[PDB]
């Protein structure tokens, strides 16, 4: 009886196995745009993905992960609120059954159709497993998706999903350039938070971009054909794999922009 996104094992249940679910820096949160304060001190954000090496795409039963070679400083995130260098390890998405839900963060209580998470780990801790035990171990770049025009840089991801329909399936996924998933502006909000799935560790500096990317209805419909289940099991469509907003508690959300 594992965690998931159903009535019986969904976010309102996670606290029983993972009591930090009710902790002091849980994610996601609602971003109240009128309460977020411009922080003139935030350093410029640096997204350096030119040398990124994608390797594989995996359906893990909760989402699909595009995995990178993180055995050297190829693809790194620096600057903004960050001290030091954070190495890209994977990206994934969270999405809805309908276009009116799917994001984990909200903006003035608005839900987007989906949310992209680019996961990076602080290289001063040596490996990802050590980094997640630290309060500044990870930096997650979050990007909202709205439905409208296609995102050409997403289509290579969309077209492989048929080959990883069910939990535990993977496929080779080399030479994918995650720069094609970014919006034009790097204006962001930032706050200290957590993983949004078990084990809900409080190790993340969240960096959520203000500008959403546009994807087509056909692109997101292909995300919604994935399965939570394993091969041969009763089909359970992989939809609504998002955690709702958590209490902000004793935190301030900072804006990079006026
Ligand atoms: N949104 S999420 O919590 O699933 N996420 C962000 C940080 C991280 C680390 C390892 C695996 C996944 C992720
Ligand atoms: Zn995520």
Swiss-Prot record:
Residues annotated as binding Zn(2+) are: 92, 94, 117
Tell me what effect the entry lists for residue 140 to F/Y: Strongly impaired activity
Q: Which domain of life is it from?
A: Eukaryota
Name the consequence of residue 60 to T: Reduced activity
Q: Which residues constitute the catalytic centre?
A: 62
Q: Which reaction does it catalyse?
A: hydrogencarbonate + H(+) = CO2 + H2O; urea = cyanamide + H2O
What happens on changing residue 62 to G? Impaired activity, not rescued by 4-methylimidazole (4-MI)
Q: Name the consequence of residue 65 to L.
A: Reduced activity
Q: What is the effect of changing residue 104 to A/Q?
A: Strongly reduced CO(2) hydrase activity
UniProt-reported outcome of changing residue 195 to F: Normal activity
Which positions does the site annotation Involved in the binding of some activators, including histamine and L-histidine cover? 90
Q: Reported effect of changing residue 196 to A/C/H/P?
A: Strongly reduced activity
Q: What does this protein do?
A: Catalyzes the reversible hydration of carbon dioxide. Can also hydrate cyanamide to urea. Stimulates the chloride-bicarbonate exchange activity of SLC26A6. Essential for bone resorption and osteoclast differentiation. Involved in the regulation of fluid secretion into the anterior chamber of the eye. Contributes to intracellular pH regulation in the duodenal upper villous epithelium during proton-coupled peptide absorption.
Q: Which family does it belong to?
A: Belongs to the alpha-carbonic anhydrase family.
> How does this chain assemble?
Interacts with SLC4A4. Interaction with SLC4A7 regulates SLC4A7 transporter activity. Interacts with SLC26A6 isoform 4 (via C-terminus cytoplasmic domain).
Q: What name goes with this protein?
A: Carbonic anhydrase 2
């Amino acid at each position: 009886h594992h965690w998931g996104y159903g009535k019986h094992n969904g976010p309102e249940h996670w606290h029983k196995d993972f009591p930090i679910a009710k902790g002091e820096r849980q994610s996601p949160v609602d971003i109240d745009t009128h309460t977020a304060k411009y922080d003139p001190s935030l350093k410029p954000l640096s997204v350096s993905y030119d040398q990124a090496t994608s390797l594989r795409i995996l359906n893990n039963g909760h989402a699909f992960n595009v995995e990178f070679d993180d055995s050297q400083d190829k693809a790194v995130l620096k600057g903004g609120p960050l001290d030091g260098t954070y190495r890209l390890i994977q990206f994934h998405f969270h999405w809805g059954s309908l276009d009116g839900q799917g994001s984990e963060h909200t903006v003035d209580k608005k839900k987007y159709a989906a949310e992209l998470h680019l996961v990076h780990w602080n290289t001063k801790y040596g490996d990802f497993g050590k980094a997640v035990q630290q309060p500044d171990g990870l930096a997650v770049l979050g990007i909202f998706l709205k439905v409208g025009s296609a995102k050409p840089g997403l289509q290579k991801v969309v077209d492989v999903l048929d080959s990883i329909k069910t939990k535990g399936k993977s496929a080779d996924f080399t030479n994918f350039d995650p720069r094609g998933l970014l919006p034009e502006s790097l204006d962001y909000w930032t706050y200290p938070g957590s993983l949004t799935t078990p084990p809900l560790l409080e190790c993340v500096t969240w960096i959520v971009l203000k500008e959403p990317i546009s994807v087509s209805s056909e692109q997101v419909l292909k995300f919604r054909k994935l399965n939570f289940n394993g091969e041969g099991e009763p089909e359970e469509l992989m939809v609504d794999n998002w955690r709702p907003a958590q209490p902000l508690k004793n935190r301030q959300i900072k804006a990079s922009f006026k």
